[PDB]
Design a protein around this ligand. Structure first.
Ligand SMILES: *C(=O)CCCCCCCn1cnc2c(I)c(I)c(I)c(I)c21
Ligand SMILES: *C(=O)CCCCCCCn1cnc2c(I)c(I)c(I)c(I)c21
Ligand SMILES: *C(=O)CCCCCCCn1cnc2c(I)c(I)c(I)c(I)c21
Ligand code: NA
Lengths: 327, 7, 7, 7
């Protein structure tokens, strides 16, 4: 069997809470009044949701309404409970209300509104300083949710709303998030392919908050190198091949050995042998204004195979890459 | 959304 | 992989 | 509405 692992930070938060904090299946929802809201304009569609700008007609407040398609109530309560436990944290999207149609019983979550920039416009315009600023703002949200015993598990550009005109950022889409219980084996079929950590790709189930830090590093590399996504796999096996062609195979097999991880023999066959490629090799004329020695050192400390060796979000906030933002 | 839930 | 040799 | 959009 694989060697067990525990988070280096916030390991025991959930045992320092009443059971109902994390036992989301017992949660009793506080339902508001759907008649308080009217739709204004559609913003987007999810696999299980339709997302609208809306207005509270009792007090003129602009909000966003996320109408939920039929999924298991268990998943809905998990997302509600997590949003209520994290409400108020820095750059965490704020849940304002929870309503349901009395006839069709379709539920909806009501949130503060964000005027999100086209991520195409967004990439053209961000400077080096901007990337550092927004990265620090994401770290504030991740440190906060990790400190409250939750892993997001789906960190990626589509789930980071940036209103660049208002220099405003929110981490959204808490539908994959989960409570961290040390020793628990989690489903590895989470995150989007390009942002999946090596632990997911080798089926190492005793992962923790540090999964989100791998995803964050994938976002940082795509932004500073102007290559989206940075690790562009065709499937979950190719995804680890793409990672191994940058980080190298030597460290991958050291990680597998350290945790007594068993790979499919054919997976081992396709991984081959790849030298580590220095981060400087990804710098080009078109992206060099976003790259600095500090950025590459920071990236190198996020994108590590061994989840225990990655910076925590709190450690990341201390990195010299952020000195120009905070001091 | 490449994935959906936890188990 | 398609065979069970687990411990 | 109804139909599934893609690209
Ligand atoms: C896999 O990621 C596809 C499904 C994701 C659906 C995303 C639609 C955009 N979206 C979703 N929730 C949103 C919120 I709450 C807010 I506030 C905003 I602004 C947007 I755009 C949201
Ligand atoms: C048990 O069968 C797990 C499957 C093992 C992975 C094979 C994936 C599909 N495949 C087959 N040969 C491949 C090569 I050679 C390469 I390089 C890649 I990337 C992939 I995807 C391969
Ligand atoms: C079609 O592309 C999207 C599906 C249509 C969503 C509108 C449904 C009817 N409707 C109109 N206003 C609504 C509110 I305010 C709420 I809260 C709900 I739940 C629904 I159903 C609403
Ligand atoms: Na400054």
């Amino acid at each position: 069997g694989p060697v067990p692992s525990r988070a280096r930070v916030y390991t025991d938060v959930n045992t320092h809470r009443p059971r109902e904090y994390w036992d989301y299946e017992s949660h009793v929802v506080e339902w508001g009044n759907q008649d308080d809201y009217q739709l204004v304009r559609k913003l987007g569609r999810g696999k299980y949701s339709e997302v609208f700008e809306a207005i509270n007609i009792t007090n003129n407040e602009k909000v966003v309404v996320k109408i939920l398609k039929p999924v298991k109530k268990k998943k809905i309560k998990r997302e509600i409970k997590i949003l209520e436990n994290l409400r108020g944290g820095p750059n965490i999207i704020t849940l304002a209300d929870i309503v349901k149609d009395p006839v069709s019983r379709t539920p909806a979550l009501v949130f503060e509104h964000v005027n999100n920039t086209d991520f195409k416009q967004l990439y053209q315009t961000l400077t080096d300083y901007d990337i550092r600023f927004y990265m620090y703002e994401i770290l504030k949200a991740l440190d906060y949710c990790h400190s409250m015993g939750i892993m997001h598990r789906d960190v990626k550009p589509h789930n980071v709303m940036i209103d660049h005109e208002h220099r405003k950022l929110r981490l959204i889409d808490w539908g994959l998030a989960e409570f961290y219980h040390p020793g628990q084996e989690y489903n590895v079929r989470v995150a989007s392919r390009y942002f999946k950590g090596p632990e997911l790709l080798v089926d190492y189930q005793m992962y923790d908050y540090s999964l989100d830090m791998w995803s964050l590093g994938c976002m940082l590399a795509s932004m500073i190198f102007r290559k989206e996504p940075f690790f562009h796999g065709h499937d979950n096996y190719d995804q680890l091949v793409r990672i191994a062609k940058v980080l190298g195979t030597e460290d991958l097999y050291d990680y597998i050995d350290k945790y007594n991880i068993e790979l499919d023999p054919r997976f081992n066959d396709i991984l081959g042998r790849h030298s580590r490629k220095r981060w400087e090799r990804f710098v080009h004329s078109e992206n060099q204004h976003l790259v600095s020695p500090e950025a590459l050192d920071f990236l190198d400390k996020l994108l590590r195979y061994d989840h225990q060796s990655r910076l925590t979000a709190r450690e990341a906030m201390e990195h010299p890459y952020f000195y120009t933002v905070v001091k | 959304x490449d994935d959906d839930d936890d188990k």
